[PDB]
């Protein structure tokens, strides 16, 4: 649900947890588990190329299926498990032939519900089926970009995609950020919205629940000296500049959409 905690100590006065009674209270399925070494924001050169990540708790990766390539086989969803890597929870799917996988959990997906992939499937929520056979208007998720790529769009918590058109061999999508965009109709998609849509109501309470979630403190550019940031300096919080990045690029309202390879697929833009 949505649990507003009680102020026993300061720094508990603003916590809201999302206590999910459905999820599994046990150690996960080990044949799909592996390690995941954090970077800390650094790459081959060893430099912090993306700032403000580091620390945090350990979190082992789960090989979560996206392509849904057991095609034509029924599948029992066996338990819901919490996943560290994603906003949404994973489900331990048992296929009929004794193979277990993980999938992303859609909204209505409780334990024991029978999903299945393939082109020859029902329009039950949770099924994977290609987009020339999904009825127009119906709401999908775990959307692909390329056929057989696996799944790129609408794969976070409560995130869905309304299929809006069917243009010959294309599908005009209404993405979650409100950007109509064409994909090839042979791409598979999974029906419903994604579960755990209550994740928007988590308010984290204190600094520590950021710092163990991977975040590191983000210093305002005004507090820095002028050699450090393009802002910065002035005795007594002067600002007087047009607000920019640490690398001098105009932030706060300056578009950077320059690909032109993928301007074929865009219909509408974010508004």
């Amino acid at each position: 649900a949505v649990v507003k905690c009680k102020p026993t100590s300061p720094g508990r006065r603003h916590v809201v947890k999302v206590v999910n009674p459905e999820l599994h209270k046990g150690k996960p399925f080990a044949p799909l588990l592996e390690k995941n070494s954090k970077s800390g924001g650094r790459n081959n050169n060893g430099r912090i190329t993306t700032r403000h990540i580091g620390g945090g708790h350990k979190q082992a990766y789960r090989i979560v299926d996206f392509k849904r390539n057991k095609d034509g086989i029924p599948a029992v969803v066996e338990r819901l498990e919490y996943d560290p890597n994603r906003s949404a929870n994973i489900a331990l799917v048992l296929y009929k032939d004794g193979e277990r996988r993980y999938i992303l959990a859609p909204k209505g997906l409780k334990a024991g519900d029978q999903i299945q992939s393939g082109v020859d499937a029902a329009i039950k929520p949770g099924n994977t089926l290609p987009m020339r056979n999904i009825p127009v208007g119906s709401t999908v998720h775990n959307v692909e970009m390329k056929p057989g790529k696996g799944g790129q769009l609408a794969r976070s918590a409560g995130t869905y995609v309304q299929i809006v058109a069917r243009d010959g061999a294309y599908v005009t999508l209404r993405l979650r950020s409100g950007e109509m965009r064409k994909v090839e109709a042979d791409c598979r998609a999974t029906l419903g919205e994604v579960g755990n849509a209550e994740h928007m109501l988590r308010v984290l309470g204190k600094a520590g629940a950021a710092r163990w979630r991977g975040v590191r403190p983000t210093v305002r550019g005004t507090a820095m000296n002028p050699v450090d940031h393009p802002h910065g300096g002035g005795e007594g919080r002067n600002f007087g500049k047009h607000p920019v990045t640490p690398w001098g690029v105009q932030t706060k309202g300056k578009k950077t959409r320059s690909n032109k390879r993928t301007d074929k697929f865009i219909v509408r833009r974010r508004s």
């Binding site: 082109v119 020859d120 020339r132 056979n133």
Partner: protein, 149 residues
């Protein structure tokens, strides 16, 4: 480029002429498919007696084998009774392969890439006028009649 030819290229190529093709057209299309040769001052002397009169009909018997390999099948039909969904919405669309694997087994022994399809890649079960490619100037018709199962 001034490129001499082998095929009858539809617009301008005419079996042995000094043709101003472009640099890329001489190279990516005419050379690896082998339908023309860049001849400038040396392959003309190879082309006059050895290649103009002798080898031309030695190529054009392959042009005869489209009238022959086309007319291996004088019945000219294909029956595909695939498993159709619940009153409509067929299981799988038919590109080159199901037609090629059937006509290879029942019809003309032709390869995969000659399977031409004007009316899509065969979604809806029914009659479909399906035409083929054997030559640039010769065009066949083997009528597919898709059946529901």
């Amino acid at each position: 480029m001034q490129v001499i030819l082998l095929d009858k290229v539809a617009n301008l190529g005419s079996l042995g002429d000094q043709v101003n093709v472009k640099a890329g057209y001489a190279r990516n299309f005419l050379v690896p498919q082998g339908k023309a040769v860049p001849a400038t001052k040396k392959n003309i002397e190879f082309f006059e007696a050895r290649r103009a009169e002798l080898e031309a009909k030695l190529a054009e018997v392959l042009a005869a084998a489209n009238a022959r390999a086309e007319k291996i099948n004088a019945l000219e039909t294909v029956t595909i009774a695939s498993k159709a969904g619940d009153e409509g919405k067929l299981f799988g669309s038919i590109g080159t392969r199901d037609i090629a694997d059937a006509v290879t087994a029942a019809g003309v022994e032709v390869a995969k890439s000659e399977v031409r399809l004007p009316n899509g890649v065969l979604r809806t079960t029914g009659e479909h006028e399906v035409s083929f490619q054997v030559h640039s100037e010769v065009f066949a018709k083997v009528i597919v009649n898709v059946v529901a199962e």
